[PDB]
Amino acid sequence: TSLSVPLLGRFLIFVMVVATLIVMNCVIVLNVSQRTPTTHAMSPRLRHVL
Amino acid sequence: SDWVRMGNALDNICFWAALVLFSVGSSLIFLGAYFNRVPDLPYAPCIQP
């Protein structure tokens, strides 16, 4: 039925969204970690921040 | 090495962010169930204990 969403489905969709966000985060962290000076220039602002 | 350290720092802060998100959301979703007990109705139990 479609009057409401069951708790089981809500939890599964929630953890799927969290896993998707964590996948995006892992891609970002890999992208930052593997930058080489022959491709990228050393961004000083983000370095100061982090 | 600088780039690797930046990645490590981002990894460290985002771990805590993700842990808080996961724990808080799961806890809210399941605490919704913990408070869905059968209402204390003004009736005797169906089966006498």
Added chain:
Amino acid sequence: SDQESNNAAAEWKYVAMVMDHILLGVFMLVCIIGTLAVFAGRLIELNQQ
């Protein structure tokens, strides 16, 4: 000789990276555009009831 070979390899890697950036933009835009093009007409028609 190794330095020259590595510079040419780096040029190839740079080209691959530029392609990747362009394709990231294209594919995210296509995701949005398709998600709208499949549903938006019906959802607008139902909202306009």
